[PDB]
């Protein structure tokens, strides 16, 4: 009757490498007890932004399904992860619906992500024909054209590559620091419980 076990939060939060913005990886958590106390240790002076659950009383609540989304974005752009925002990274790479019942965690990570030589391994899309529906992922790298002439796999004027590259460096101001973001989504009171913290009889 008791789910016991342990939720793999340490694997999600402390993974060696996180995905890029346009190819954010989704992970599912189930059949374990969630201890939302190690969370406060990571980014302790940084604030959890939760959107429908009080972060203090989150321990005593059972969730039907928990999904974790991880990526790496620039500093000042983190404010775009909130629901209802508009911008380049909130409309061309990753958008949240305006019904989001979850909580987002962000912390400056300019100790292992960025390098003095410059980190070009993180990419982001810049050009799209139209908007993207909430919680969508596109990896296709077909060349996007805005003029009249068709693009037969070419570059230059009036024909651009949709993927641009972040250029992270140590001695940059807050805003150009690589921020690692993990957002947790879970809905309430609509299905049998699968994951939650301590509970007795």
């Amino acid at each position, epitope marked *: 009757p008791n789910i016991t076990n342990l939720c793999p939060f340490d694997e999600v939060f402390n993974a060696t490498r996180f995905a890029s913005v346009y190819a954010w990886n989704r992970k599912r958590i189930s059949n374990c007890v969630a201890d939302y106390s190690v969370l406060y240790n990571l980014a302790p002076f940084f604030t959890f932004k939760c959107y429908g659950v009080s972060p203090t009383k989150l321990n005593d609540l059972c969730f039907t399904n928990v999904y974790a989304d991880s990526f790496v974005i620039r500093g000042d752009e983190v404010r775009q992860i909130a629901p209802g925002q508009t911008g380049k990274i909130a409309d061309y790479n990753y958008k949240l619906p305006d019904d989001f019942t979850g909580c987002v965690i962000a912390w400056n990570s300019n100790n292992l992500d960025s390098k*003095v030589g410059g980190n070009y391994n993180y990419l982001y899309r810049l050009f799209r024909k139209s908007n993207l529906k909430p919680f969508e992922r596109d990896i296709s790298t077909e060349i996007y054209q805005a003029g009249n002439k068709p693009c037969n796999g070419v570059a230059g004027f009036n024909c651009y590559f949709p993927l641009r590259s972040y250029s992270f460096r140590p001695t*940059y*101001g807050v805003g150009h620091q690589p921020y690692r973001v993990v957002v947790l989504s879970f809905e309430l009171l609509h299905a049998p419980a699968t994951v939650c913290g301590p509970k007795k009889s």
Partner: antibody
Amino acid sequence: QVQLVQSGAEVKKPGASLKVSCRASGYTFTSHFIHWVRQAPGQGLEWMGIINPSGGASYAQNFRDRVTMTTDPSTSTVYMELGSLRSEDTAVYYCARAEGSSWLGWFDPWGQGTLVTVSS
Amino acid sequence: SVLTQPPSASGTPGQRVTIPCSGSSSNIGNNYVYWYQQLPGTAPKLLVYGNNQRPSGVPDRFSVSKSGTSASLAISGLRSEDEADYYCAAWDDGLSGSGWVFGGGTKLTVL
């Protein structure tokens, strides 16, 4: 046998460019970062940049846009050049080693020091 | 120079003297604090790193403590061989930029 050797310099003129080299020996050169610092006479200390022994570099905001410094893993020498000097930049320049990871340094070796004077 | 130090300090031999380095959350709150000593006419050296340990070839006479958002270097058993300036260093991340902010440098005198 760890040391960071430099070369002396003489007076300059405003608007010119000055170049100094830091040479290391006795240890694996392509393993440790390099830090640059400047100390005005009768004043404190302020550092300039961090460098891979073979690669790029990063510079502080105050001393950006006018410093250029490359790598040369042939004689284990790293050169730095400052352009558009001014009479307020007269100081002593030091090069220091660092821990291989950096980002939390312990500047144990330091350079002899180059005196830079800018007067007309 | 966000780091704040007293420009001058003095003490009699055998007296415990404390040199403070008071910073902020960005520079002293998150990262380590390193203490360097510069004799006149010589390049700076290393005295204390990591708030606990010291390099080889350095006596255990100097002690370091860190509290809140500030640090202190106490020199028990002061002697005549401590006529040098003391600098505190800590990586600082700010809205404008980021780097190794240093201190003004305290000129310590022995009577």
